[PDB]
Every structure is written in C-alpha cells, then in structure tokens.
Amino acid sequence: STLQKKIEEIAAKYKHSVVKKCCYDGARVNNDETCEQRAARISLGPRCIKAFTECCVVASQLRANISFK
C-alpha cells in the first residue's frame, strides 16, 4: 500500500463525489429550462457538466414514464 495508492484512492473519491453532486443537481426538476440550457450555465469541469446533463436527461425520462403495477 504505497503513498501513490492512497492518493489515487482519494482522487477517485473526489471525482466520484463531484459526479454525485452534479448528477443530483441536474436530476432536480426544472420545468422552465431544458437540460442543455441549464448545463450551459455551468462553469465547472467537463466531468461535472457530463454528470449534470446525463442525470438531467435521464431524470426527465423517468418522470415521464412513471407507472403503477
């Protein structure tokens, strides 16, 4: 367990943490604007932008395809 391995572990935790935040931010309902419009106002990294956009797009499809067995 080198120092390299411990830092790579922390770095991966940071990225996963960022993605998780950006995703659920995009997953929030926003009826006024499209996902592309909302993500255009994000000045953060491309990692955050992709997480935001994908979750925003997917969240919208899930909300429109919700049913009851």
Numbering used by the authors: 677 to 745
Q: What's the paper's own text on this?
A:
Anaphylatoxin signalling through the G-protein coupled receptors (GPCRs) C3aR and C5aR leads to various cellular responses including chemotaxis, oxidative burst, the release of pro-inflammatory molecules and activation of the adaptive immune system. Here, we have reported the crystal structures of the human C5aR antagonist hC5a-A8 and of the two murine anaphylatoxins mC5a and mC5a-desArg.
This screening identified a mutant form of C5a, C5a-A8Δ71–73, as a potent antagonist of both C5aR and C5L2. Furthermore, we determined the crystal structure of human C5a-A8 at 2.4 Å resolution. Interestingly, hC5a-A8 forms a three-helix bundle with an extended N-terminal helix as seen for hC5a-desArg. In hC5a, the short sequence preceeding the core region (residues Tyr690–Ser693) forms a loop that allows the N-terminal segment to pack back against the C5a core in an H1 helical motif antiparallel to H2. This arrangement is reminiscent of that observed for hC5a-desArg. Although the C-terminus of hC5a-A8 is shortened compared with hC5a, it could be traced almost entirely for all four molecules in the asymmetric unit.
